[PDB]
Each structure stands twice: as C-alpha cells, then as structure tokens.
Amino acid sequence: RGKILVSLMYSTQQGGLIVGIIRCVHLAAMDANGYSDPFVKLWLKPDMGKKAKHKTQIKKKTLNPEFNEEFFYDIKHSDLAKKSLDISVWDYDIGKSNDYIGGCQLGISAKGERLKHWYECLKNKDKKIERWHQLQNENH
C-alpha cells in the first residue's frame, strides 16, 4: 500500500489545526506500467460540516511522490484531541474515476501510536509534528 508523511501543527492564535501532507512512499500501482496517481484526502470528524474533507495535488504516474501541502482545520484546541483526522490516499485517473490506495485515522481517541503523533500535536501546537503513517485499507 505504501506510507504517507503527515505533518501536524495547531495554530491556537487562529484557533484551528494544521495538516501538512508532505509526501508518500511505496505506493501501489493502478496502471499496467507499475505505477499510480495517488493523492491524499483529509477529513476531521465528527466535523462541523460536509466540507471537512480534502484532497492534495494528484501525484500522477508515481508511487513515491511528494505533496508538501499545508492544510488548515477549523477546530477548537479543546476539541482537537477528541477530533479524528482521516488521512486517506487514493489513486487518480484522467478521463476515468479515482481509486482507493490506503489511509489511516488520527484521533486522540486512538491508542498505540496514532495517539502519540496526533495528540502530541495538541501539545506541540506552534510546533510542527510530522511522521510517516502506514496506509491501510478501509472500504475498497
């Protein structure tokens, strides 16, 4: 499936969270060429609206591209923790439909590892918290 580098960071000043989609590696190939067009979509829940979802630039013809996209969430730090960032990577296709490659969930409600990276973000607001996440298959 591959892994995607996610850089977190909360801006208390602005009163919101910051999601940074750096890059991905070891991504699957959707084309017969042995490559793919993976992109990353982010959605924090429970959310406040139906626009909490996102999608980084399309990394066409590549399994180990670099997004380097900095997002901005509108959630109160006090709620951040309880939040749950869903970073999913999907394959893109011109003239056709997309595809599910893999993703992961990031919410303080988690336990094991994601809580360490996510939660810490709440502690290291102004500080950038980045790390590599292992892509998983939820609903293919």
From Swiss-Prot:
Keywords: Calcium, Cell membrane, Cell projection, Cytoplasmic vesicle, Lipid-binding, Membrane, Metal-binding, Methylation, Phosphoprotein, Postsynaptic cell membrane, Protein transport, Repeat, Synapse, Transport, Ubl conjugation, Zinc, Zinc-finger. One of its GO terms (biological process) is dendritic spine organization. Residues 1-133 form the C2 domain. Specifically expressed in brain. One of its GO terms (cellular component) is dendritic spine. Ca(2+) 4 binds at D31, D91, D93, D99. Ca(2+) 3 binds at D31, D37, D91, Y92, D93. Ubiquitinated. Deubiquitinated by CAND1 to prevent its degradation. It is found in: Cytoplasmic vesicle, Secretory vesicle, Synaptic vesicle membrane; Cell projection, Dendritic spine; Postsynaptic cell membrane; Membrane. Its main location: membrane. One of its GO terms (molecular function) is zinc ion binding. Binds calcium via the C2 domains. The calcium-bound C2 domains mediate interactions with phospholipid bilayers. Interacts with RAB3B, RAB3C, RAB3D, RAB8A, RAB27A and RAB27B. Interacts with RAB3A; this interaction recruits RPH3A to synaptic vesicules. Interacts (via C2B domain) with SNAP25. Interacts with deubiquitinating enzyme CAND1; this interaction results in the deubiquitination of RPH3A. Interacts with GRIN2A and DLG4; this ternary complex regulates NMDA receptor composition at postsynaptic membranes. Interacts with SNCA. Plays an essential role in docking and fusion steps of regulated exocytosis. At the presynaptic level, RPH3A is recruited by RAB3A to the synaptic vesicle membrane in a GTP-dependent manner where it modulates synaptic vesicle trafficking and calcium-triggered neurotransmitter release. In the post-synaptic compartment, forms a ternary complex with GRIN2A and DLG4 and regulates NMDA receptor stability. Also plays a role in the exocytosis of arginine vasopressin hormone. This is Rabphilin-3A. It comes from Rattus norvegicus (Rat). The gene is Rph3a.
